[PDB]
Structure 1
Amino acid sequence: HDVLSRMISEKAALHGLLNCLIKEFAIPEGYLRYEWPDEMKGIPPGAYFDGADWKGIPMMIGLPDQLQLFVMVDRRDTFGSQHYLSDVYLRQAGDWQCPDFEPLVARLLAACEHIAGRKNPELYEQILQSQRLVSAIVSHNGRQRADAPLQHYLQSEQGLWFGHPSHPAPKARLWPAHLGQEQWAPEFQARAALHQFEVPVDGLHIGANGLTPQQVLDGFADQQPASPGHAIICMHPVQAQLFMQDARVQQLLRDNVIRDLGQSGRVASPTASIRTWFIDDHDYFIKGSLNVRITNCVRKNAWYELESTVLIDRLFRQLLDQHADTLGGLVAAAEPGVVSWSPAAAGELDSHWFREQTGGILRENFCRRTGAERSIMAGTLFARGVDLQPMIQTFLRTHYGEALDDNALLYWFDDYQTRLLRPVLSLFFNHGVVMEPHLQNSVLVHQQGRPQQVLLRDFEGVKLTDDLGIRYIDDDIHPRVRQSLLYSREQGWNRIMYCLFINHLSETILALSQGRPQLAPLMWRRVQQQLRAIQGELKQPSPELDALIAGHPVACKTNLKVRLAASYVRLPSPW
């Protein structure tokens, strides 16, 4: 079982790396051919030939350091979404080889490093560490029914075994090592009581929408233990350990100005975002700062960001009330409450530090409103299970009473895509509101398998265009919070492109059409039609939409190229 788990994890990892290679270099720079090699010596027949036919289509990548890559794929895809049907062969001077995982990664990286002209051995390490975690993960969860992550929201958050599917090291998480992974890994069904402090109320910065400051505090922590003039704040246990190494906190603990309460907060389970916690049957998610690098960001939230949260949440309520008819059926998770602390006399830069350390966001637990059994995170929905099969296939067969034919499938997709596209594009063109509707920021609400809503999340990412979305922001807003939220229209459109089409739906189509690649052309064609529809539904000019429909190239955010340097490339349209 362990060897098998190592094997699973390696295939996953190399796949995600191929994704990076193909999306970020091979296609934009014309290194990719759908052809058979000249000499084939080194490849066993069984790798491209199944007894009856070729195992799909041959993929060639010649790299300008004279390295060549060969893999069998199920489909020709302009966003570089396809199943890999063989192991990976490399060639150099003649003679194909199938290197072990570690030697393979190394050389593939050396290839990119060469095009980019720049090295990162930090990256190689992270690639290795990511995969060895996936090995642990698969070995832990390898006994379960493959599609258990789809039966329950929490399990949907703890079942993204492989993380971002187009990422060199999706599961790289760099904590002071003595702390371990397991205790904080959703993939291990981690639970921890939150860490808690007593702080004097006069240092508190609270934002609240439709709630009292007190209620915001209750959301985070039962305030009962608090002595007069004081309140209880909570924090990622890891974040509290880091927080306490700082002599400024040392000083405050010694002078009794604040108190270390223990892991005495609510018992919660971190979600796939790691720093956001879920509490079954509580009105809120708890989001907090974590000064730890995770898939390359450190997961801090700055003062002005804490502050922007409040404005976006307040904007979203206005729009859902007064402008419902133009939000394309938007369902979004409210972020109505914000807390942070700093000493009353702290002085500007300590104040910033302190609030960034202690900042917390209250997010609506949509599950009360939606049913835990009925909500699944998009990322997991369209991810692979512990047996490398997409989980969606068996999940839907259990709901539909029988195996879905092509028509059942095409129909399901249509129902899904429309509930993503309409809200987001209606937010952009009509109101200049820029969402980040990638897979981690989306939640399917279904009824016996049938799509009802694609809930959208994460006000942190929301942005307001300089030409339209600006006007919703007041002149009484601090210049830094304003800058934080401001985007150019070009910027907005770039992010939306990456997210909707390449990040999100490209994956949807791939999971849905696994084993039936002929559906892909058909699903994308439905996406085009859907775009024309939305357009004629719209209250403001949308020339970026004409362009997309017309088959202009699509923006693609990079996960490998960025690390070796260049953030967006351009992928050919699927129509």
Structure 2
Amino acid sequence: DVLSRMISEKAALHGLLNCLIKEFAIPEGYLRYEWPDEMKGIPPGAYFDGADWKGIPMMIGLPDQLQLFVMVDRRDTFGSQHYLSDVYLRQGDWQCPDFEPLVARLLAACEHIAGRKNPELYEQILQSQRLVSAIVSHNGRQRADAPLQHYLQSEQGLWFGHPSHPAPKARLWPAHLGQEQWAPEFQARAALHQFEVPVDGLHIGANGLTPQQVLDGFADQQPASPGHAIICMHPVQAQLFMQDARVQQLLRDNVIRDLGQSGRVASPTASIRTWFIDDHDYFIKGSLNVRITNCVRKNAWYELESTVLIDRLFRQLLDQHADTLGGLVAAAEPGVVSWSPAAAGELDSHWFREQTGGILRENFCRRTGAERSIMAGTLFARGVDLQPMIQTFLRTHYGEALDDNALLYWFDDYQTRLLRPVLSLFFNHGVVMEPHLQNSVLVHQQGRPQQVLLRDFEGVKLTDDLGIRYIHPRVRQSLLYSREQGWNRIMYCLFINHLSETILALSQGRPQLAPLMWRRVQQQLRAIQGELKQPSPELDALIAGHPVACKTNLKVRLAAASYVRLPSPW
């Protein structure tokens, strides 16, 4: 309980330091691995364990006459390391300030470096940590590695959320309407909200499903009277929707009808607005007009059309270019539904469509099996005891302690399945996936990696030189990336977001494996380069040793910023 608060404060803190080190200290030059010239105020027990130093001293100089001390377990160029001491600060004698005080000062430091302040961020960092405390407390009695035993529990078990983010669990629910009833981390379940709507205003996109079968995937249609159909949305989305005067106007005129929470019974997933239904053919991905992680997460009209277009393309690449796809497994997105009143104003129509918009994703579990499939973020995350959960999950599958050569063999299998499809798609066809931890699902046979399923069509882009060569101009704009923009994304998602976290969780207690795992990534890049059918200059530079693009989560909140570069592990 106090324990739960204490667990949450260390987790949040570690998230905030990842950002400081990655976004600011490494790019700008503020980090050195050295001991302070004067340790006054730091207790012996923070850096001395009885026999030796607890790892390596880390110092961060900060323009404002501010210093930061922390012990770490490794040197890493991507800023991935286990922190082995509390954080200490000096302006003067060293201090160990409380959570909030520490956040306040560190954020302040980042605001000077940035030249801008953010009124809202501070309260978001604290909100996020107070949820995590509620979460740890609620979930603290289960076996620690239980999230990795079933697909759904892994969506529900990203306790700490994104691991390089200042406010991972920021969720700004409306005037009451609840928290815990909608949180995956609380095993949230609910009947989806339903409306009955005239068919003249429906928009349906579909691939190999009839417009009727697309509706059937969202709602049982039988209660619809003729000339009508049933749409569903997040109960929170439905209450905000029934708060516009344009929806009240329509409900009073009996153009649309409210059917309450009468829909399929579903569990939301780590993305909050995508719902899972055990043994149904589809996940449901709706719009939620709510600030999740600082951002309204919505299905814009042209994205509803993106999705269809993308789905059809992956199907066409598979049927004809399977062997230049590098072993690709992806969840399809076969249908898309929205509603707007007939002969509505262009602006009204945008807003109705965006509010009611929904996508169907293939429930890959029917195909992969729900007890073989783990969201990649939960796989490489830490349990309620703050240990990386991967460690014991391998232990019970392997049948004993894993030696160095079993971690390297396992890693090799894993990273091969991530890199081969991603890099095949970008250089052979100009398709840009987004393989961060939360768009990837490992499929595994008794623990041995089989495939890494990739999802999320919102995140798929097409390059102007290649991909786009496979419709409305605004949809086109949404889909299009330059070859450079796209390569930055693939650099960040694959190496910094994903495998950097993979190697860290596998290499706990054994930091010497880290460069061994990096050399092996470098050797896998080479073998895949020779397997490509098109020019790959960008991959040559990465293989050479050139800097790697990295997306930012703190910095983008301070400036009026987007990406930095970090030196390459090889």
TM-score, with structure 1 as normaliser: 0.99
In the TM superposition, what is the alpha-carbon distance from 1:349 to its structure 2 partner? 1.2
In the TM superposition, what is the alpha-carbon distance from 1:177 to its structure 2 partner? 3.8
After superposition, give the CA deviation of every residue in 1:32-51 in whole Å (9 maximum; x if it has no partner).
00000011011111111111
Partner residue of 2:61? 62
In the TM superposition, what is the alpha-carbon distance from 1:202 to its structure 2 partner? 1.1
Distance in 2 between the 1:32 and 1:302 partners? 42
After superposition, give the CA deviation of every residue in 1:376-415 in whole Å (9 maximum; x if it has no partner).
0000000000000000000110111111111111111000
Distance in 1 between the 2:354 and 2:9 partners? 37
Distance in 2 between the 1:74 and 1:484 partners? 42
Structure 1: give runs of 5+ residues left out of the alignment. Answer: none
Distance in 1 between the 2:270 and 2:509 partners? 28
More deviation, 172-181/205-214: 172-181
Partner residue of 1:371? 369
SS in 2 for 1:233: strand
In the TM superposition, what is the alpha-carbon distance from 1:468 to its structure 2 partner? 0.4
After superposition, give the CA deviation of every residue in 1:121-151 in whole Å (9 maximum; x if it has no partner).
3100000000000000000000111100000
In the TM superposition, what is the alpha-carbon distance from 1:181 to its structure 2 partner? 1.2
Partner residue of 1:185? 183
In the TM superposition, what is the alpha-carbon distance from 1:201 to its structure 2 partner? 1.1
Partner residue of 1:573? 568
Distance in 2 between the 1:102 and 1:119 partners? 17
After superposition, give the CA deviation of every residue in 1:157-202 in whole Å (9 maximum; x if it has no partner).
0000000000000000111141221011101010010000000111
Alignment of 1:225-304 (within 5 A): 225-304=223-302
Distance in 1 between the 2:563 and 2:187 partners? 34
SS in 2 for 1:28: helix
In the TM superposition, what is the alpha-carbon distance from 1:81 to its structure 2 partner? 0.1
Structure 2: give runs of 5+ residues left out of the alignment. Answer: none
Distance in 1 between the 2:333 and 2:566 partners? 34
Distance in 1 between the 2:295 and 2:495 partners? 23
In the TM superposition, what is the alpha-carbon distance from 1:66 to its structure 2 partner? 1.1
In the TM superposition, what is the alpha-carbon distance from 1:344 to its structure 2 partner? 1.1
Distance in 2 between the 1:91 and 1:572 partners? 28
More deviation, 174-183/486-495: 174-183
1:37 maps onto 2:31 in alignment: no
SS in 1 for 2:17: helix
Identity %: 100
After superposition, give the CA deviation of every residue in 1:324-374 in whole Å (9 maximum; x if it has no partner).
000000000000010001011112111111110100000000000011000
Distance in 1 between the 2:507 and 2:536 partners? 31
In the TM superposition, what is the alpha-carbon distance from 1:547 to its structure 2 partner? 0.1
In the TM superposition, what is the alpha-carbon distance from 1:297 to its structure 2 partner? 1.9
Distance in 1 between the 2:13 and 2:67 partners? 16
After superposition, give the CA deviation of every residue in 1:16-42 in whole Å (9 maximum; x if it has no partner).
000000000000000000000011011
TM-score, with structure 2 as normaliser: 0.99
1:470 maps onto 2:468 in alignment: yes
Alignment of 1:384-403 (within 5 A): 384-403=382-401
User: Which of 490, 512, 519 matches 1:518?
Assistant: 512
Distance in 2 between the 1:170 and 1:521 partners? 28
User: Which of 141, 150, 153 matches 2:139?
Assistant: 141
Distance 1:177 1:519, change over 3 A: farther
Which consecutive aligned stretches of 4+ in structure 1 deviate over 3 angstroms post-superposition?
none
After superposition, give the CA deviation of every residue in 1:534-563 in whole Å (9 maximum; x if it has no partner).
100001100000000000000000000000
Distance in 2 between the 1:206 and 1:307 partners? 9
Distance in 1 between the 2:217 and 2:372 partners? 24
Partner residue of 1:360? 358
In the TM superposition, what is the alpha-carbon distance from 1:266 to its structure 2 partner? 0.4
Distance in 1 between the 2:109 and 2:197 partners? 53
Distance in 2 between the 1:179 and 1:140 partners? 20
SS in 1 for 2:263: coil
Q: How many residues align?
A: 569
Distance in 2 between the 1:332 and 1:22 partners? 33
SS in 2 for 1:455: strand
In the TM superposition, what is the alpha-carbon distance from 1:59 to its structure 2 partner? 0.3
Distance in 2 between the 1:320 and 1:67 partners? 55
Distance in 2 between the 1:129 and 1:549 partners? 41
Distance in 2 between the 1:403 and 1:220 partners? 46
SS in 1 for 2:260: coil
Partner residue of 1:549? 543
SS in 1 for 2:11: helix
Distance in 2 between the 1:297 and 1:210 partners? 33
Distance in 1 between the 2:275 and 2:251 partners? 26
Distance in 2 between the 1:52 and 1:334 partners? 55
In the TM superposition, what is the alpha-carbon distance from 1:262 to its structure 2 partner? 0.7
1:21 maps onto 2:11 in alignment: no
Partner residue of 1:85? 84
In the TM superposition, what is the alpha-carbon distance from 1:296 to its structure 2 partner? 2.1
Distance in 1 between the 2:119 and 2:106 partners? 13
After superposition, give the CA deviation of every residue in 1:32-79 in whole Å (9 maximum; x if it has no partner).
000000110111111111111101100000101111111100100000
Distance in 2 between the 1:315 and 1:290 partners? 27
Distance in 1 between the 2:72 and 2:562 partners? 26
Partner residue of 1:426? 424
In the TM superposition, what is the alpha-carbon distance from 1:450 to its structure 2 partner? 0.5
Distance in 2 between the 1:280 and 1:247 partners? 36
Partner residue of 2:203? 205
In the TM superposition, what is the alpha-carbon distance from 1:295 to its structure 2 partner? 1.4
RMSD of aligned Cα (Å): 0.6
Distance in 2 between the 1:356 and 1:471 partners? 28
In the TM superposition, what is the alpha-carbon distance from 1:117 to its structure 2 partner? 1.1
In the TM superposition, what is the alpha-carbon distance from 1:301 to its structure 2 partner? 1.3
SS in 2 for 1:346: coil
Distance in 2 between the 1:461 and 1:132 partners? 30
After superposition, give the CA deviation of every residue in 1:457-510 in whole Å (9 maximum; x if it has no partner).
0001100001000100xxxx1000000101011100001110000000000000
SS in 2 for 1:385: coil
SS in 2 for 1:90: strand
Partner residue of 2:553? 559
After superposition, give the CA deviation of every residue in 1:105-131 in whole Å (9 maximum; x if it has no partner).
000001000100111131000000000
SS in 2 for 1:559: coil
SS in 2 for 1:26: helix
Distance in 2 between the 1:267 and 1:412 partners? 37
